[PDB]
Design a binder for this molecule. Structure first.
Ligand SMILES: CCCCCCCCCCCCCCCCCC(=O)OC[C@H](COP(=O)([O-])OCC(O)COP(=O)([O-])OC[C@@H](COC(=O)CCCCCCCCCCCCCCCCC)OC(=O)CCCCCCCCCCCCCCCCC)OC(=O)CCCCCCCCCCCCCCCCC
Ligand code: HEA
Ligand SMILES: CC(C)=CCC/C(C)=C/CC/C(C)=C/CC/C(C)=C/CC/C(C)=C/CC/C(C)=C/CC/C(C)=C/CC/C(C)=C/CC/C(C)=C/CC1=C(C)C(=O)c2ccccc2C1=O
Ligand SMILES: CC(C)=CCC/C(C)=C/CC/C(C)=C/CC/C(C)=C/CC/C(C)=C\CC/C(C)=C/CC/C(C)=C/CC/C(C)=C/CC/C(C)=C/CC1=C(C)C(=O)c2ccccc2C1=O
Ligand SMILES: CCCCCCCCCCCCCCCC(=O)O[C@H](COC(=O)CCCCCCC[C@@H](C)CCCCCCCCC)COP(=O)(O)O[C@H]1[C@H](O)[C@H](O)[C@H](O)[C@@H](O)[C@@H]1O
Ligand SMILES: CCCCCCCCCCCCCCCC(=O)O[C@H](COC(=O)CCCCCCC[C@@H](C)CCCCCCCCC)COP(=O)(O)O[C@H]1[C@H](O)[C@H](O)[C@H](O)[C@@H](O)[C@@H]1O
Ligand SMILES: CCCCCCCC/C=C\CCCCCCCC(=O)OC[C@H](COP(=O)(O)OCCN)OC(=O)CCCCCCCCCCCCCCC
Ligand code: HEC
Ligand code: HEC
Ligand SMILES: *C[C@@H](COC(=O)CCCCCCCCCCCCCCC)OC(=O)CCCCCCCC[C@@H](C)CCCCCCCC
Ligand SMILES: CCCCCCCCCCCCCCCC(=O)OC[C@H](C)OC(=O)CCCCCCCC[C@@H](C)CCCCCCCC
Ligand SMILES: *C(=O)CCCCCCCCCCCCCCC
Ligand code: FES
Lengths: 158, 160, 223, 163, 139, 100, 312, 54, 92
């Protein structure tokens, strides 16, 4: 009974940097932050993109996606009501492909944030996603999608 | 021995990089004659004691184990002559069947040795024979107490 | 591609929607979310055949692929479009690069393997046992692309070695070491698996001891 | 594992991705690359240090709420990064094996399982003491540096321990 | 040996009839003609019965009426030397264990275990077959 | 049938032991982490392929059934041979009782 | 009395179902009559106790009755022959092969869920010049110029020159009523029409059963290559409303999760539903817009959780 | 391989003498030294494959 | 026919009078044939106690504790049955 009701394989989170928030009627999958940092933090005032996929669990709808703002004044450029038993993909995570060169509704609801606060990759930051059905705190992480490691300066032995 | 040295590969150290404190392997067994030691490590349930500002790690146990093991192996004929009382000059061997108690004791000891040796290989046993590692560990834990008893009973009745 | 995504969606809608929601969000306690897993994850998981998993147990085992290379690419592209993530390496032609993934250095690849891979797999890439019903499978069967994608995406109880931990150079080096160990003949006679002490002791007690005792019975008498 | 030169390179939190483990060592600024003769011996000392190796594991954010901390080690984790000694608390073998989605630090010498989510305490096998957690943080330029020494000795236990 | 022969010729006749009718009624009146699985199985079970019955009929013609095949036969008629009936032997359990080792080596794909089980099976079958022929040790 | 023993009595002992151990190995699917054979008793084809039910439980089930079947075949050989050859002097094959 | 004496068969909703139910009633009558007479015989011979008043006088010892055995071996042949004739005639009315089905539903049934394609709609009154899509059927013929060898082999494919991972047998349609693990697939059908079901299985052989039809079939992976008549027609569905359907084979671990539904509506309601499904709308939206519950009303896609004691 | 055979043959010999009772009155000391001997062999084997730093 | 009867003079040494008898063990005189039932029962109780105490350790799971409990209960039941039968004189 290693394959009983409590089985290791079934209860597994995806091996993705972004967190998964199932709270509310809508499910938030692969929520993360694209924020390349060249120093300890990313200085306040620099725009960082907010990625996630919103999936409407029920066919009966929570397609509003009202504000989803927290400390940082989240802004949803080209906000639209995409979720209808489908997927709302706000941005273009590193590796995300485009079917055609033209983009419907211009940007596909890209979410950007002005930090107003230092942030460094490896931390958890609370982003309150608000929907007409309810609200959820997710603690969005910071993800470096495809950027290779930067060249650390060569060490000088002493 | 020459045929084995040719046709069978023993300790292919080149596959085994130079020792580093950080590098590891999953197998990590010693030769079969210390596999009983390693299995005794694996099966002994993580029992430690903490005196006044001191620690008695679970590893200590195995040392005591070896003591007892050796202390019982080296001294066995004297225990045999103390219990049985045979203090006579014996030159004719005895068929194992003719000594059911000692045959059962030796079968029990061999059973415990085999259980410990295979417990050391519980990692590989689980990998090849699909059994959960925890299941093998607990099979060995219950066995080091049960299997000796069953083997003693069976060997006694078999000798008779 | 448009047709590629169409085919991937067709295959997905009738093979895995049960484990993963139609929107690729994992069904609760059946399968995880495929958003952000990437084309590399899909390629490694389906090419090895693991994904039509057909049971929830301690460890999903490898099995014959349920889809062909083109269908593997279709599924991977579908998943890549949905969430966006790691992508399987490819060569100039466009196929899954396998020869090009063999790093030139092997000693450095060997150090990388022993520090990272051997921890659970083996000295020489064989399998290893894990906590409760889990294990690390043998690396002999996996092709260079499969090894690379396995490192690039930690399937289950595998640490996920991002491109930053092991840069494409280090990943190719480790792939080269894995292939070299897997296909290298065991110098010094039949290599009894890769585990030394256990097969070696078993072979002693069978071959050498049975031979010696049989020869003793032949030379000696019975009484 | 480069052949001799710069075997150790500074590290950044972004490098470890959720559900990823990397072995890290205590590299000083003075212990520069192995180019010179003075170095390549300090680096050899770091490599051969029995208790030097540590494993840094990035706990998945979704699993973050499950983490149970150790008294006096509540801030040792830098966000979702946890540094635990690789040296097993039982007989001092490296505990290299790491299982994500179950967060099990496994030692193969004697098959001992520590829970990585909860402070790295042994939940199976011979080990009875938790792996020592290394304080970590990020310094100037965002590189991961130990935030201090282990609050307790890190190798396998001995008589003069836990006082 | 005539009654147990006739039994097998009756079975052979029925099985031949069944195979023929199945083949005829599947080659047409079926989606894909002859099923080729049930048909071959019926044909070769007919062959099974045919071989056993042919051997039994051969022996029956070769054999004069035995007491067991003779009605109104006294028990004293069959009294006499019966053949060798193997006494106690521990080789069957060893053969079973050897085949079990080979079987687990097959199920669990362990080619080394398959080879070890095959060697054990050969050794144990040799022991069983040679059990009552091994001459005394000559020293 | 008035016989002293079965035709090949070492063979029927072998049949019993082949059964016992084949059944044991088939049942041993449970100790495995994946578990025993999840496909129905009938074990229809595609569900039994390595793709579906890839666990070692199915393989153990298959091989244990093979071993038990070999034991059963040997038992059948033994019993048919015993009935045809080993019989009492007066026990005509139409005078042997219906259980035989 | 019939429902109780039907041994719990759901009164069919199709002419074929009704006739099968009548055959079942008759067969159960015959079986119960035979069972009653045999039980009477057994219990009445059980009245033959060893009465103590009987001295050492053993019974007639008769055995070996020729005429009685001949009679009771002839009569069962008569009963089974009549049953076989009724079986053949009823079976004839189960695969009629009407070349002009009113609606052809493509029941493609994959591991642990279903999918219905509405392959074609053709109403006799005159309407619905509808057809399935079928650009989606693509093969996997691995007819590459060369394999691992330098030349020569030019391997074509394992099976009939193609790969096992071909999936050509599957046919895809424009209006797919796919069901998710959290959404029960509801098959919308018109009442009073001939409905054909083209049965296919994506992954593993398993079963398609609608108990109210009093009929079932096995969706095999590739029925044509298995000499199977996967497609089957239903002459009519009088009763409207929802009716459960169940997988009646072994799909796999989540084999009990395969439950689907068939919601038979009026022909005009079906027309509206198909009109609103042609336009981009889920099955739930189309059903709701015709003033019908969106979710399955006979069954629910019960918990994906492995069980009750799982810690959420 | 000779080290492994040395160990295994020592074990088999020990089992033989134990089960046959060859350790009784005349030959306890032999047993004792043999036991010590076995122990030494084991440890030397440990020191053998431990010599090549691996 | 190639065999001859054997006879052995074996030094006999307790006086093999208390404990086992040749009827129970046909080779009682030829060597150690009696293990006291007291050591049986004590060892069985110790085995059961060891099985229970292993419930205390480092293992979050409880299937393991239940298996330990079952095996120890089986051992205790066997020892109790044997002791009861011996006390009553092998009855029931
Ligand atoms: C897959 C394909 C592989 C097929 C190989 C099978 C070949 C066997 C046929 C040979 C002819 C034969 O058996 O004649 C009986 C014949 C007559 O028996 P006997 O002992 O001589 O006569 C004295 C009494 O009958 C003795 O009295 P008894 O009471 O012992 O009767 C037993 C005896 C006599 O019993 C009979 O003759 C009864 C009929 C049954 C025998 C046939 C079954 C044996 C093979 C079954 C395996 C399935 C495949 O039969 C046996 O010796 C049994 C063999 C044990 C095999 C068990 C395997 C597990 O036995 C022999 O003398 C020779 C037997 C040697 C068999 C070799 C098997 C080794 C095969 C492994 C090779 C590896 C390749 C595959 C990987
Ligand atoms: C000889 C064959 C046989 C026998 C005797 C039985 C006996 C029983 N069966 Fe049977 N059953 C089958 C053969 C048999 N079955 C087959 C072939 C199937 C189909 C399998 C498939 O679909 O693949 C089946 C399917 C089957 C199912 C369907 C399961 C499913 O597929 O979903 C069910 C459900 O209740 C069931 C119930 C029972 C019950 C309640 C009994 C009772 O008669 C059982 C009596 C119970 C006992 C005798 C146990 C009491 C003993 C103890 C408590 C002591 C235990 C102690 C130790 C083990 C140390 N059986
Ligand atoms: C502490 C402890 C012992 C825990 C339990 C672990 C354990 C030993 C479990 C049992 C392993 C088995 C037998 C798995 C098969 C499935 C199973 C349990 C079936 C039911 C068991 C049962 C009683 C069946 C009835 C008939 C019967 C006795 C069957 C036994 C079948 C077998 C395996 C017989 C042979 C025994 C055997 C050789 C076991 C393996 C022993 C070892 C350590 C082998 C080491 C070894 C390995 C690991 C290689 O990879 C290798 C590769 C290439 C060449 C050589 C080798 C080699 O020698
Ligand atoms: C050992 C003994 C007779 C003790 C008598 C009573 C006594 C002195 C008790 C006090 C000592 C105590 C505390 C004993 C309990 C545990 C114990 C024995 C500890 C000491 C361990 C030790 C130093 C020696 C024990 C080794 C021993 C005597 C083994 C049995 C030797 C024999 C006769 C084996 C059968 C002959 C034969 C054909 C063997 C080959 C066939 C096979 C495969 C047998 C099984 C087998 C074996 C035997 C392996 O060693 C092995 C190692 C690595 C991988 C696999 C295997 C394996 O499969
Ligand atoms: C020579 C060796 C002979 C063997 C000697 C010893 C005999 C004594 C046997 C004692 C049996 C004890 C079995 C209990 C073991 C135990 O306690 O562990 C369990 C797993 O039970 C099991 O498998 C049952 C296994 C029983 C099989 C024993 C069969 C005997 C075999 C070994 C005999 C063949 C020997 C052949 C030798 C060859 C010749 C040698 C020369 C659960 O583990 P786990 O896996 O982590 O499950 C998690 C939950 O905990 C958690 O809640 C849940 O949530 C889940 O997450 C789940 O994962
Ligand atoms: C007096 C001693 C006589 C010894 C005989 C000497 C035989 C000489 C053999 C020929 C020369 C040396 C071969 C060296 C090349 C070589 O090593 O041979 C392998 C095979 O290895 C296997 O698989 C096992 C195959 C089964 C046949 C051999 C079994 C022999 C055993 C039974 C003899 C020892 C006794 C053990 C008894 C134990 C039983 C206990 C009851 C073959 O390649 P392969 O098959 O592909 O190995 C996979 C890599 O590819 C892949 O990456 C890798 O990752 C793996 O998957 C690897 O398996
Ligand atoms: C015959 C009748 C025997 C009884 C038959 C009943 C069989 C039902 C067993 C499993 C069904 C599948 C469920 C599988 C899930 C496990 C159950 C569960 O959910 O309980 C939670 C913990 C881990 O969860 P955790 O949060 O991480 O830790 C918690 C924090 N304190 O597991 C447990 O307590 C494990 C308890 C499971 C029951 C024990 C079964 C073993 C009995 C063996 C008896 C054999 C005797 C041998 C005789 C010689
Ligand atoms: C049954 C439940 C299935 C089905 C039929 C499929 N998957 Fe999925 N999947 C499942 C589990 C239990 C897990 C986690 C453990 C494991 O992989 O065995 C997964 C995981 C994946 C992944 C890995 C994601 C990552 O590593 O980040 C991928 C890429 C994936 N699954 C995809 C996938 C595809 C393409 C499928 C149809 C071919 C598919 N799965 C089916 C459970 C199940
Ligand atoms: C125990 C922690 C762990 C470590 C660390 C680890 N592995 Fe793995 N490995 C696993 C597990 C568990 C699997 C099983 C994957 C699955 O079930 O999907 C696996 C699978 C694989 C596979 C798939 C092979 C196949 O046939 O499916 C390859 C290749 C592989 N690992 C190589 C590596 C390499 C290279 C490294 C070093 C970068 C490494 N592993 C480090 C545990 C680990
Ligand atoms: C999931 C839990 C729950 O398990 C249960 O509820 C059922 C438990 C059944 C009890 C198992 C007792 C084991 C007895 C061992 C036999 C004696 C061995 C000593 C001699 C070597 O438990 C689990 O985790 C999984 C439970 C699965 C149980 C499967 C048992 C299968 C036994 C099989 C390997 C064959 C054993 C050989 C017996 C030989 C008997 C004749 C000699
Ligand atoms: C290797 C040799 C092992 C020798 C151990 C010598 C122990 C001395 C120190 C014990 C102590 O005071 O430390 C505190 C303790 C951790 O906590 C408790 O006080 C509760 C203990 C409850 C269980 C006690 C069972 C003890 C059994 C042993 C005495 C048997 C040894 C044989
Ligand atoms: C673990 O992953 C598989 C759990 C299987 C659950 C069903 C348990 C059935 C047990 C049957 C009895 C086995 C044999 C008992 C012999 C003593
Ligand atoms: S060496 Fe780590 S558990 Fe013992």
């Amino acid at each position: 009974c290693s394959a009983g009701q409590i089985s290791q394989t079934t209860t597994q989170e995806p091996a993705v940097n972004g967190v998964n928030a199932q709270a509310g009627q809508v499910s938030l999958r692969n929520v993360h932050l694209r924020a390349p940092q060249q120093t300890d933090y990313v200085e306040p005032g620099t725009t960082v993109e907010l990625l996630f996929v919103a999936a409407n669990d029920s066919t009966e709808s929570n397609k509003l996606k009202s504000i989803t703002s927290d400390v940082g004044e989240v802004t949803l450029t080209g906000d639209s009501t995409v979720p209808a038993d489908g997927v709302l993909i706000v941005g273009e995570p590193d590796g995300q492909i485009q079917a055609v060169e033209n983009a419907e509704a211009a940007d596909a609801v890209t979410a950007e944030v002005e930090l107003t606060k230092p942030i460094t990759n490896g931390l958890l930051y609370d982003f309150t996603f608000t929907f007409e059905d309810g609200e959820t705190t997710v603690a969005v992480p910071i993800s470096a999608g495809e950027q290779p490691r930067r060249p650390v300066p060569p060490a000088g032995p002493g | 021995l020459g045929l084995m040295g040719g046709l069978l590969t023993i300790n292919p150290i080149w596959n085994l990089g130079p020792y580093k404190p950080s590098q590891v392997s999953a197998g990590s067994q010693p030769d079969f004659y210390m596999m009983w030691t390693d299995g005794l490590i694996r099966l002994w349930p993580a029992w430690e004691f903490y005196p006044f500002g001191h620690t008695i790690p679970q590893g200590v146990w195995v040392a005591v184990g070896m003591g007892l093991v050796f202390a019982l192996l080296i001294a066995y004929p004297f225990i045999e002559k103390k219990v049985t009382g045979d203090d006579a000059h014996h030159n004719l061997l005895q068929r194992p069947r003719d000594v059911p108690v000692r045959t059962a004791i030796g079968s029990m000891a061999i059973a415990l040795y085999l259980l410990l040796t295979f417990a050391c290989m519980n990692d590989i046993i689980a990998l090849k024979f699909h059994i959960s590692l925890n299941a093998t560990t607990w099979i060995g834990r219950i066995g080091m107490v049960v299997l000796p008893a069953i083997v003693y009973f069976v060997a006694y009745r078999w000798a008779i | 591609q448009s047709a590629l995504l169409r085919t991937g969606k067709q295959l997905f809608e009738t093979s895995c929607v049960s484990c993963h929601g139609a929107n690729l969000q994992g069904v609760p306690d059946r399968g995880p979310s495929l958003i952000g897993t990437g084309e590399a994850a899909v390629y490694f998981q389906v090419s090895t055949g693991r994904m039509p998993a057909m049971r929830g147990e301690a460890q999903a085992p490898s099995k014959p692929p349920h889809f062909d290379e083109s269908q593997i690419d279709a599924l991977g592209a579908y998943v890549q479009a949905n969430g966006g993530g790691p992508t399987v390496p490819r060569d100039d032609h466009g196929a899954v690069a396998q020869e090009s993934l063999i790093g030139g250095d092997v000693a450095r690849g060997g150090d990388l393997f022993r520090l990272n891979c051997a921890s659970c797999h083996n000295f020489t890439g064989k399998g290893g046992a894990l906590s409760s019903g889990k294990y690390a499978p043998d690396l002999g069967d996996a092709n260079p692309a499969q090894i690379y994608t396995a490192m690039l995406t930690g399937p289950q109880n595998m640490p996920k070695f991002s491109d930053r931990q092991l840069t494409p150079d280090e990943k190719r080096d480790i792939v080269a070491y894995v292939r070299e160990s897997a296909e290298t003949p065991s110098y010094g006679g039949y290599g009894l698996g890769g585990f030394g002490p256990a097969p070696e002791g078993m072979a002693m007690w069978i071959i050498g001891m049975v031979a010696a005792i049989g020869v003793a019975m032949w030379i000696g008498s019975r009484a | 594992g480069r052949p001799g030169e710069s075997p150790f390179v500074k590290m950044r939190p972004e490098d470890i991705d959720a559900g990823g483990m990397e072995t890290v060592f205590p590299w000083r600024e003075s212990d520069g690359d192995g180019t010179t003769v003075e170095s390549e011996h300090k680096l050899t000392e770091i490599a051969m240090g029995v208790r030097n190796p540590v494993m840094l594991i990035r706990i998945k954010p979704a699993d973050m709420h499950r983490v149970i901390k150790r008294k006096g080690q509540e801030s040792f984790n830098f966000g979702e990064l946890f540094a635990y000694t690789k040296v097993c608390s039982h007989l001092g073998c490296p505990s290299s094996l790491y299982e994500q989605q179950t967060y099990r630090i496994l030692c193969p010498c004697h098959q001992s399982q520590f829970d990585a989510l909860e402070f790295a305490k042994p939940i199976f096998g011979p080990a009875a003491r938790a792996l020592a957690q290394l304080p970590i943080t990020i310094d100037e330029d965002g590189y991961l540096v130990a935030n201090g020494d282990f609050v307790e000795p890190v190798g396998p236990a001995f008589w003069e321990r836990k006082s | 040996m005539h009654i147990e022969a006739r039994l097998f010729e009756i079975l052979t006749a029925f099985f031949a009839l069944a195979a023929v009718v199945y083949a005829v009624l599947t080659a047409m009146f079926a989606t894909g003609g002859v099923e080729w699985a049930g048909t071959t199985a019926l044909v070769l079970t007919t062959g099974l019965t045919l071989i056993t019955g042919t051997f039994f009929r051969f022996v029956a013609r070769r054999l004069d009426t035995r007491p067991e095949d003779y009605e109104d036969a006294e028990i004293s008629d069959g009294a006499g030397e019966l053949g060798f009936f193997a006494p106690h032997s521990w080789w069957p359990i060893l053969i079973s264990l050897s085949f079990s080792t080979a079987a687990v080596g097959a199920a669990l794909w362990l080619p080394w275990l398959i080879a070890a089980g095959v060697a054990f099976v050969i050794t144990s079958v040799c022991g069983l077959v040679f059990e009552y022929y091994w001459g005394p040790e000559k020293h | 049938i008035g016989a002293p023993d079965v035709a090949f009595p070492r063979l029927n002992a072998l049949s019993f032991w082949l059964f016992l151990f084949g059944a044991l190995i088939a049942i041993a699917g449970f100790i495995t982490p994946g578990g025993a054979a999840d496909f129905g008793w009938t074990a229809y084809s595609p569900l039994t392929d390595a793709i579906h039910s890839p666990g070692a439980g199915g393989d153990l089930w298959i091989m244990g059934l093979a071993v038990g079947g070999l034991g059963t075949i040997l038992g059948g050989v033994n019993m048919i041979t015993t009935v045809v050859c080993m019989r009492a002097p007066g026990m005509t094959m139409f005078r042997m009782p219906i259980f035989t | 009395w019939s429902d109780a004496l039907a041994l719990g068969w759901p009164t069919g909703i199709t002419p074929e179902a009704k006739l099968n139910r009548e055959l079942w009633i008759g067969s159960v009558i015959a079986s119960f009559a035979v069972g009653a007479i045999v039980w009477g015989l057994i219990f009445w011979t059980s009245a033959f106790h060893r009465k103590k008043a009987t001295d050492t006088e053993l019974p007639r010892q008769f055995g070996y009755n020729m005429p009685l055995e001949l009679t009771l071996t002839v009569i069962p042949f008569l009963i089974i022959s009549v049953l076989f004739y009724f079986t053949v005639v009823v079976q004839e009315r189960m695969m009629h092969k009407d070349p002009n089905p009113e609606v052809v539903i493509d029941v493609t049934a994959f591991q642990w869920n279903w999918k219905f394609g509405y392959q074609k709609i053709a109403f006799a009154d005159g309407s619905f010049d509808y057809d399935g899509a079928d650009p989606e059927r693509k093969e996997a013929m691995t007819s590459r110029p060369e394999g691992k060898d330098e030349h020569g082999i030019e391997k074509v494919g394992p099976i009939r020159g193609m790969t096992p991972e071909d999936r050509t047998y599957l046919n895809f349609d424009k209006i797919e009523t796919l069901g998710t693990s959290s959404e029960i697939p509801v098959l919308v059908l018109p009442a009073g029409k001939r409905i054909e079901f083209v049965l296919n299985s994506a992954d593993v052989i398993h079963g398609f059963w609608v108990p109210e039809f009093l009929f079932k079939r096995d969706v095999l992976p590739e029925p044509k290559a298995n000499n199977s008549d996967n497609v089957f027609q239903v002459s009519e569905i009088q009763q409207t409303g929802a009716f459960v359907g169940r997988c009646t084979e072994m799909c796999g671990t989540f084999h009990a999760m395969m439950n689907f539904e068939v919601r038979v509506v009026e022909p005009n309601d079906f027309k509206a539903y198909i009109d609103q499904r042609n336009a981009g709308k889920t099955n739930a939206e189309a059903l709701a817009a015709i003033n019908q519950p969106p979710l399955a009303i006979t069954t629910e896609p019960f918990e994906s959780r492995r069980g009750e004691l799982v810690p959420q | 391989w000779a080290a492994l055979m040395f160990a295994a043959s020592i074990m088999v010999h020990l089992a033989r003498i134990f089960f046959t009772g060859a350790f009784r009155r005349p030959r306890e000391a032999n047993w004792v030294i043999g036991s010590l001997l076995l122990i030494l062999a084991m440890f030397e084997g440990f020191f053998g494959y431990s010599l090549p730093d691996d | 026919m190639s065999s001859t009867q054997d006879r052995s003079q074996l030094d006999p040494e307790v006086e093999r009078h208390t404990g086992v008898d040749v009827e129970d063990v046909p080779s009682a005189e030829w060597g150690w044939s009696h293990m006291p039932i007291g050591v049986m029962h004590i060892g069985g109780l110790l085995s059961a106690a060891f099985l229970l105490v292993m419930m205390r350790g480092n293992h979050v799971g409880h299937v393991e504790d239940w298996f330990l409990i079952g095996f120890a209960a089986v051992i205790v039941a066997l020892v109790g049955r044997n002791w009861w039968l011996r006390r009553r004189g092998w009855i029931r």
